[PDB]
Design a protein around this ligand. Structure first.
Ligand SMILES: CCCCCCCCCCCCCCCCCC(=O)OC[C@H](COP(=O)([O-])OCC(O)COP(=O)([O-])OC[C@@H](COC(=O)CCCCCCCCCCCCCCCCC)OC(=O)CCCCCCCCCCCCCCCCC)OC(=O)CCCCCCCCCCCCCCCCC
Ligand code: BCL
Ligand SMILES: CCCCCCCCCCCCCCCCCC(=O)OC[C@H](COP(=O)([O-])OCC[N+](C)(C)C)OC(=O)CCCCCCCCCCCCCCCCC
Ligand SMILES: CCCCCCCCCCCCCCCCCC(=O)OC[C@H](COP(=O)([O-])OCC[N+](C)(C)C)OC(=O)CCCCCCCCCCCCCCCCC
Ligand SMILES: CCCCCCCCCCCCCCCCCC(=O)OC[C@H](COP(=O)([O-])OCC[N+](C)(C)C)OC(=O)CCCCCCCCCCCCCCCCC
Ligand SMILES: CCCCCCCCCCCCCCCCCC(=O)OC[C@H](COP(=O)([O-])OCC[N+](C)(C)C)OC(=O)CCCCCCCCCCCCCCCCC
Ligand SMILES: COC(C)(C)C/C=C/C(C)=C/C=C/C(C)=C/C=C/C(C)=C/C=C/C=C(C)/C=C/C=C(\C)CC/C=C(\C)CCC=C(C)C
Ligand SMILES: COC(C)(C)C/C=C/C(C)=C/C=C/C(C)=C/C=C/C(C)=C/C=C/C=C(C)/C=C/C=C(\C)CC/C=C(\C)CCC=C(C)C
Ligand SMILES: COC(C)(C)C/C=C/C(C)=C/C=C/C(C)=C/C=C/C(C)=C/C=C/C=C(C)/C=C/C=C(\C)CC/C=C(\C)CCC=C(C)C
Ligand SMILES: COC(C)(C)C/C=C/C(C)=C/C=C/C(C)=C/C=C/C(C)=C/C=C/C=C(C)/C=C/C=C(\C)CC/C=C(\C)CCC=C(C)C
Ligand SMILES: COC(C)(C)C/C=C/C(C)=C/C=C/C(C)=C/C=C/C(C)=C/C=C/C=C(C)/C=C/C=C(\C)CC/C=C(\C)CCC=C(C)C
Ligand SMILES: COC(C)(C)C/C=C/C(C)=C/C=C/C(C)=C/C=C/C(C)=C/C=C\C=C(C)\C=C\C=C(/C)CC/C=C(\C)CCC=C(C)C
Ligand SMILES: [Fe+2]
Lengths: 44, 258, 307, 281, 52, 54, 43, 48, 44, 55, 52, 48, 44, 43
């Protein structure tokens, strides 16, 4: 409970859950984007 | 050692240039930490320490032994405003201006702000008051340029609000610092020499309007001015540039008027 | 179109300030000279007093003999003709010995031998003056920042005239004593060493020489901007932070994100200028001794398109 | 993100354009209307430099060079791959610089301080505009400007310098070099003096301005004063830039031969042009 | 008090300031173009300072 | 994804729209200049060679 | 959690209007990309 | 797009209109110069 | 009802309708100009 | 990897999101420019040769 | 309420209206110039209708 | 010429200033076109 | 005191001083422009 | 010694989370090296 930012643990959990959902959405678009490039032009 | 390379193209010249990058990186770190002895730790817009303090840590404190037995000053140290700030938050999110709650020039906020310095006159190397009136100064006299004493004092509204009576002089530097302008009420205010423009026949004060001349903070002693009184006077006059813009008759002021 | 505080609009002339007396031997201190109104418009009008001690005398004697020796050679090169002396004043030169003599003192008096004598006088003159800066600070009990800031200048000065010639094993590598000659020496230095621009250390010195102009233009303008709050009295702002120090802090904090203090800005000031010659001495020292061509050195270090 | 004293100075007003539309702080930075232009021109200028590295075919930061259009294109548009990018970057650089100066003006008005800083910066911009705009326009080719490379804009200096022989003999250059050397000399002296007076020998009290004047009067017999030295610092820097801008704007426009040839006028003065002896004849 | 004119006046105000600044810049560029043409640059002009 | 509205509980809309406006216009200008530089996709050049404007 | 002072509903309204603008901007972009790809494909 | 009017409760209207006037003029200047840069589409040259 | 500028909702609607009307008028003239140039010199 | 939410007790959400936005954009711009530099994976040059736009 | 700006604003107001009218006239002249260039006038054009 | 101010009690000031702006612009346009008409003083031609 | 426009004598004097100042400023710039052209191309 | 100011119990919790971040970062890196070593071994 260092609380440098003043957020409570409940606020951190909610902020993180939304943040991870944004991250997994960003990662999901990237994985599709990499599949499209690898199919069109594989680099391995 | 012409062309002598330890490995690859790395040679004595290459040794020196990289060793300097390390030195310069270290030096920039050292210089930046020294600059962090004032105004730190950072604070939120309310007054609590912020979650962010910067990549550079605070330096080990150092002590300045002030002259003339004024004490010591250890920085970095706990620094407080020591005055009520009459400002109101204009947005809950940070990084937004704080609007004055009342009259900003009287409340000492914004461009008219001032700091709670020591309420003592500043001393020379001999312990005497650095800034004294020319009347009380021994042998001082106007040596060159137009003598401003006796000239009418015209404000930014192109209206005369008094005349100069006395000049205050920094005794060691031997240069004028303040003009003692006597108003229509018989009292004399101090105007910094940097904020006035002594013309051929008048003292034009672009900072303040005629009605604002009476509002200049006064000095407790006619023979000396403390550091605190200097800040209030200098703050008030310089605060007039933005807070008397509606009262200024200049063309550029009208163009930049709201 | 207001008062910008660039020039004082009024001058006051009180009694001359005789200065502090911490540990300064007042016997060696002279009297107060005149008051210059022309100087008073910009800064202080009072000239003097000036302290003259043992190192002051040695600095002046060697400094005068250095100045005198160049002058006598300048007259000899003029044929003792005052008209020729003024015509070829900048084109006169006290050239160092020829490359054949190397570091030997066997050069003829008119072929480089006189330069060794004049250079010795300058050497003693400058080093004696450096101690004078050291001792004057010690006498008043101040820091030795000037002494070590000066030693940065000496390092470049020593390198150009003394250290680099020794490593190159020839006095011909040194600097001639003349207005246009030491300009020509500078140009010939780059051309021989292959475009000294591609010297990394010469580039750094230009960075700090540009930066010194940048920092002093920044610092000088900042204090003149906050001079309306009495910001020019920087020592009191260090002791008791007024509103000028805060506004000066805030202007640069809101402009470029970071700021300094009233005392920490002068640490930037001293190090910005010291590195001008500090990196300069290494840059000249390497040239010839380590690198005989900087552009070829630049090519092999990824600074030029070829290679 | 605020200093211990920053709050009381954060008030509206002083803006030149936009009012409160852009009157906010991003961290420590104040944005303003001209800061938005600053960030856009800065970001756009930086990206086009990075994109110019792609077209050039190199990634070494020192080899990156945005060359201006060749002399054949004169003062017109050029293909982006062979000069056109430089023109866009120069426009972006010009926009970024002037927006930065005007952003400083807004900060000046908000704090109530003088406009010495943006006026000092404007001298640098006119120095910059001399090299990339004023000199090339007079010479009628963007190719006379300098490439935007770390070590290729030095090639421009060396090549332009040696176009006129030894460039040291440029009389405006000699004035500016003396100013640049003097300013650095003043800065070292000024920086060291205050530190010596503020960080004295251990145990001894912090010194006063009188000790600063006493030190330099005991040293060189004259002290210019705390106000004078900062005036001197500003004027030494601006004069150095003013004469540096002057030295280039007359080179290739008014003077075309070797600069050493210029100095023969003094030697060829009527009353001593023919006297035997000396260096010249 | 017409809203359509008021909005158009503001946008014309901004466009005028941008226009004056741009026209002022062209004036400086044109001035240096004229001076360079007047001076004998074309008769004797320096080679390319940088590789094309 | 339905909780993304909370980004405005953190970021003030005034600063974001300014930041976003700069970012998008910077991005848009960036891409157009990339296409212009390349000999292909320089639509001004494509039409000139297609319609013999030279 | 409160930083900007917006209530939960005000954020939801603010986001919905913002998302409406985003999809409108995206739709023109998709139309533009189809137009360019038809005119000159890059794959 | 039925609530785009609310952006005027975020940004002051008169300030935006001035800024938009600057943006539109500079953008118009930007495009015209690029057209003049190309050897084609340069109306000042193809006419003569 | 954020009230960052102080304008009421009704004033925002009226101003936006004015702004949009000018925008479509500006858009329409630009389309005509683009048609004129494309007729004179197509860029596709 | 369950208590990673406590990073927001250490790091301010506003500063990280700005830093992350700048980081991601500059990282994305960097990778695109790296691909464009190489003659292969420069999709602008790839399509020109594939559909013979050189002529 | 600045008198110098007020007078300059009026004169700029008149100069702007004269400028728009003159620029609008040039637009019509330029439009007919463009149309004439587009049409095959130069390929076959009538002789002088009046004695030069 | 010490009573030329009284002409503003004859002619309304704002009306004259608008009319004078029109007159000055048209006169400026008039002279510039005449210069372009002459084979010399035609800056748009002698430059090229 | 004819009062055809209704302006008092003082307002006429103030307006005329404003008008004359602009006139001399306009005259001065025109003189500079005429000097510049006469240097470039004299017409006498 | 409490320069940071946090307690040992806070230090233990921070360290446990920090090492979880470290081992997760290392675990991805080990898999990253295994794939690269198989694709192009450097020994
Ligand atoms: C922004 C500034 C970025 C710096 C750009 C430096 C650069 O371009 O290097 C290119 C370099 C590869 O260039 P290369 O020619 O193929 O050389 C490959 C090997 O380095 C070496 O292979 P090589 O033999 O073929 O190349 C010869 C030469 C040239 O090789 C180099 O590229 C040297 C580059 C050194 C970069 C500095 C590394 C700093 C590390 C601290 C962080 O290398 C050397 O001879 C050694 C020079 C370095 C010695 C350093 C020893 C003291 C280090 C103390 C710190 O790429 C980088 O590693 C850049 C890293 C930047 C990270 C950010
Ligand atoms: C064609 C010429 C070459 C070139 C050749 C050199 C050479 C050669 C040298 C420099 C050096 C310098 N060059 Mg270079 N330089 C060129 C192009 C440039 C350009 C440019 C825009 O083109 C710039 C900005 C510079 C800039 C600089 C400086 C950063 C640096 C000198 C610092 C200094 O203060 O020295 C002047 C100061 C001193 C020498 C210190 C003097 C100190 C002593 C103690 C003073 C004693 C005083 C004496 C007793 C007199 C007293 C008089 C009485 C008081 C009256 N060069 C080109 C490429 N340059 C120097 C350096 O360090 O390079 C790394 C150097 O040696
Ligand atoms: C390609 C270009 C990438 C530029 C960005 C690099 C960011 C590197 C990762 C930073 C990080 O993880 O911390 C975010 C942090 C978030 O923390 P913060 O912004 O609260 O920092 C506050 C300062 N502390 C916490 C140390 C007291 O962002 C930064 O501080 C920015 C660092 C940038 C360094 C640039 C060099
Ligand atoms: C000796 C003279 C050296 C000259 C060469 C380097 C000059 C630039 C130094 C930049 C610097 O120190 O910036 C730190 C600053 C750091 O400031 P900041 O914006 O991270 O916040 C201040 C950081 N604290 C709180 C720790 C003080 O860098 C920048 O703001 C960006 C500069 C980009 C270059
Ligand atoms: C800003 C720098 C100003 C001061 C420069 C001093 C000299 C620096 C160069 C040097 O010594 O190089 C050789 C030395 C040693 O050379 P090296 O050969 O060991 O390493 C260089 C590697 N290759 C050969 C691949 C190029 O270089 C370095 O130490 C690296 C310094 C890199 C500095 C790059 C700055 C990039 C700025 C952003 C890009 C902007 C483009 C526009
Ligand atoms: C190269 C040289 C470039 C020189 C650029 C100088 C720009 C100075 C802007 C001065 C604005 C003064 C003013 O009243 O403008 C009113 C208007 C803006 O008015 P406003 O509505 O923001 O209000 C200004 C007054 N305050 C903020 C106090 C309420 O200016 C403009 O139209 C914008 C400036 C255009 C910039 C052109 C860039 C190209
Ligand atoms: C030169 O080297 C090359 C380029 C060749 C190779 C590159 C190497 C390197 C160094 C690559 C580095 C890669 C890295 C470090 C990638 C990291 C990516 C990450 C971690 C991205 C993060 C993405 C997260 C996103 C997009 C999150 C989005 C979240 C939202 C949109 C929702 C925000 C709203 C919230 C949190 C609501 C707040 C909650 C409350 C209750 C108020
Ligand atoms: C190297 O460079 C190249 C180009 C080669 C490769 C580069 C690649 C990269 C890095 C690409 C980057 C892409 C990204 C990240 C693009 C970002 C796109 C997004 C997120 C765009 C967002 C658009 C949103 C818009 C236009 C929203 C508009 C909204 C409005 C008009 C309405 C606003 C008004 C509101 C909300 C009023 C509400 C008020 C109240 C009171 C309720
Ligand atoms: C890289 O650059 C090149 C050139 C290669 C390509 C460029 C690409 C990019 C990035 C282009 C950017 C385009 C953008 C962002 C365009 C944006 C256009 C918009 C949204 C314009 C908005 C215009 C709105 C206007 C003009 C609104 C006007 C409203 C009024 C005047 C109020 C209504 C009053 C009226 C109609 C009455 C007016 C009164 C009279 C007497 C006529
Ligand atoms: C046949 O035609 C050819 C071309 C061959 C020869 C032509 C011959 C003839 C007939 C020429 C006729 C010449 C005449 C009649 C010229 C008359 C000139 C006069 C009297 C001009 C008067 C100008 C007065 C002006 C521009 C007054 C301006 C005043 C103000 C703007 C108010 C003061 C405010 C100021 C200075 C501040 C302005 C604000 C800012 C922000 C700059
Ligand atoms: C030129 O030389 C080359 C480059 C060729 C070869 C390189 C040589 C060198 C010098 C290699 C050096 C390698 C080194 C030093 C590697 C070190 C790596 C380490 C130590 C990495 C550490 C990673 C740790 C991570 C990513 C940890 C992440 C942590 C989290 C995600 C959780 C954070 C949240 C916390 C702690 C919540 C706070 C808790 C409470 C209770 C408030
Ligand atoms: C009428 O005028 C009279 C005759 C009254 C007086 C006039 C004098 C005149 C006109 C003087 C002119 C002086 C000038 C033009 C001086 C210029 C000096 C310049 C430009 C010098 C530039 C660089 C010099 C350097 C870097 C010198 C460095 C010297 C050293 C580091 C000392 C080296 C020490 C050595 C060689 C010791 C050797 C001796 C022994 C015994 C080991
Ligand atoms: Fe200072």
């Amino acid at each position: 409970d260092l609380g440098y930012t003043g957020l409570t643990d409940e606020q951190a959990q909610e902020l993180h859950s939304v943040y991870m959902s944004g991250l997994w959405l960003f990662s999901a678009v990237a994985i599709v984007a990499h599949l499209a490039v690898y199919i069109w032009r594989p680099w391995f | 050692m012409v062309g002598v390379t330890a490995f690859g193209n790395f040679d004595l010249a290459s040794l020196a240039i990289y060793s300097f990058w390390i030195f310069l990186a270290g030096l920039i770190y050292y210089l930046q930490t020294e600059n962090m002895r004032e105004g730190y730790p950072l604070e939120n817009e309310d007054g609590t320490p912020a979650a962010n303090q910067g990549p550079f840590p605070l330096p080990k404190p150092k002590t300045f032994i002030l002259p003339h037995g004024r004490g010591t000053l250890t920085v970095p140290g706990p620094e407080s405003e020591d005055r009520p700030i009459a400002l109101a938050r204009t947005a809950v999110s940070e990084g937004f201006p704080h609007a004055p709650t009342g009259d900003p020039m009287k409340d000492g906020v914004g461009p008219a702000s001032w700091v709670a310095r020591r309420d003592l006159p500043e001393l020379d190397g001999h312990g005497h008051n650095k800034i004294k009136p020319m009347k009380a100064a021994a042998g001082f006299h106007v040596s060159a340029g137009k003598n401003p004493i006796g000239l009418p004092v015209r404000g930014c509204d192109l209206e005369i609000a008094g005349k100069v009576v006395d000049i205050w002089v920094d005794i060691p530097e031997q240069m004028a610092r303040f003009l003692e302008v006597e108003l229509k009420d018989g009292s004399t205010r101090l105007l910094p020499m940097q904020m006035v423009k002594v013309q051929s026949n008048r003292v034009h004060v672009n900072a303040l309007s005629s009605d604002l001349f009476a509002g200049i903070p006064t000095i407790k002693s006619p023979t000396e001015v403390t550091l605190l009184e200097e800040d209030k006077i200098c703050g008030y006059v310089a605060g007039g540039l933005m807070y008397a813009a509606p009262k200024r008759k200049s063309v550029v002021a009208a163009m930049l008027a709201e | 179109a207001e008062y910008q505080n660039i020039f004082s609009q009024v001058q006051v002339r009180g009694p001359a300030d005789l200065g502090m007396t911490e540990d300064v031997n007042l016997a060696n201190r002279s009297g107060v000279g005149p008051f210059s109104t022309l100087l008073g418009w910009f800064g202080n009008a009072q000239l003097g007093p000036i302290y003259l001690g043992s190192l002051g005398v040695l600095s002046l004697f060697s400094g005068l003999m250095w100045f005198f020796t160049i002058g006598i050679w300048f007259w000899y090169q003029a044929g003792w003709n005052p008209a020729v002396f003024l015509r070829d004043l900048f084109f006169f030169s006290l050239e160092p010995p020829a490359p054949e003599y190397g570091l030997s003192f066997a050069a003829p008096l008119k072929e480089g031998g006189l330069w060794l004598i004049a250079s010795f006088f300058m050497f003693v003159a400058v080093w004696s003056w450096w101690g004078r800066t050291y001792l004057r600070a010690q006498a008043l009990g101040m820091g030795k920042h000037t002494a070590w800031a000066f030693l940065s200048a000496i390092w470049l000065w020593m390198v150009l005239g003394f250290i680099r010639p020794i490593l190159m094993g020839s006095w011909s590598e040194a600097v001639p004593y003349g207005i246009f000659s030491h300009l020509d020496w500078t140009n010939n230095f780059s051309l021989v060493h292959g475009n000294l621009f591609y010297n990394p250390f010469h580039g750094l010195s230009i960075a700090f020489l540009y930066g010194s102009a940048l920092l002093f233009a920044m610092h000088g303008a900042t204090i003149l901007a906050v001079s309306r709050f009495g910001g020019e009295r920087e020592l009191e702002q260090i002791a008791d932070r007024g509103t000028a120090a805060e506004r000066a802090a805030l202007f640069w904090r809101w402009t470029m994100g970071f700021n300094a203090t009233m005392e920490g800005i002068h640490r930037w000031a001293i190090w910005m200028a010291v590195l001008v010659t500090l990196t300069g001495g290494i840059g000249i020292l390497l040239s010839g001794t380590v690198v005989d061509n900087w552009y070829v050195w630049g090519q092999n270090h990824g600074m030029a398109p070829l290679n | 993100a605020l200093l211990s004293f920053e709050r009381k100075y954060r008030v509206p007003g002083g803006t030149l354009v936009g009012g409160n539309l852009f009157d906010f702080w991003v961290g420590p930075f104040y944005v303003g209307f001209f800061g938005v232009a600053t960030f856009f021109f800065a970001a756009l200028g930086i990206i086009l430099i990075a994109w110019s590295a792609v077209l050039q075919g190199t990634w070494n930061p020192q080899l990156i060079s945005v060359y201006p259009p060749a002399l054949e294109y004169g003062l017109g548009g050029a293909p982006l791959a062979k000069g056109g990018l430089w023109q866009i970057i120069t426009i972006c650089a010009t926009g970024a610089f002037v927006s930065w100066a005007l952003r400083e003006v807004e900060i000046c008005r908000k704090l109530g301080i003088g406009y010495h800083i943006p006026f000092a910066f404007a001298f640098a911009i006119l120095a910059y505009l001399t090299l990339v705009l004023f000199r090339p326009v007079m010479m009628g080719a963007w190719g006379y400007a300098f490439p935007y490379g770390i070590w290729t804009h030095l090639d421009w200096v060396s090549n332009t310098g040696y176009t006129y022989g030894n460039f040291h003999y440029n009389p405006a250059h000699m004035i500016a070099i003396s100013f640049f050397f003097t300013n650095a000399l003043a800065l070292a002296l000024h920086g060291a003096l205050v530190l010596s007076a503020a960080n004295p020998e251990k145990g001894k009290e912090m010194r006063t301005p009188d000790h600063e004047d006493t030190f330099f009067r005991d040293l060189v017999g004259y002290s210019i004063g705390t106000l004078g030295i900062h005036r001197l610092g500003l004027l030494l820097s601006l004069s150095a830039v003013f004469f540096s801008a002057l030295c280039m704007i007359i080179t290739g426009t008014i003077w075309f031969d070797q600069w050493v040839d210029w100095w023969q006028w003094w030697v060829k003065l009527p009353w001593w042009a023919n006297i035997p002896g000396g260096i010249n004849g | 008090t017409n809203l359509r004119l008021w909005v158009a006046f503001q946008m014309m105000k901004g466009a005028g300031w941008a226009g004056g600044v741009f026209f002022g810049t062209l004036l400086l560029i044109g001035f240096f173009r004229v001076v360079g043409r007047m001076l004998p640059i074309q008769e004797n002009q320096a080679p390319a300072p940088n590789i094309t | 994804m339905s909780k993304f509205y909370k980004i405005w509980m953190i970021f003030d809309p005034r600063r974001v729209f300014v930041a976003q406006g700069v970012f998008l216009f910077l991005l848009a200008v960036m891409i157009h200049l990339i296409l212009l530089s390349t000999p292909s996709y320089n639509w001004l050049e494509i039409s000139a060679a297609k319609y013999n404007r030279v």
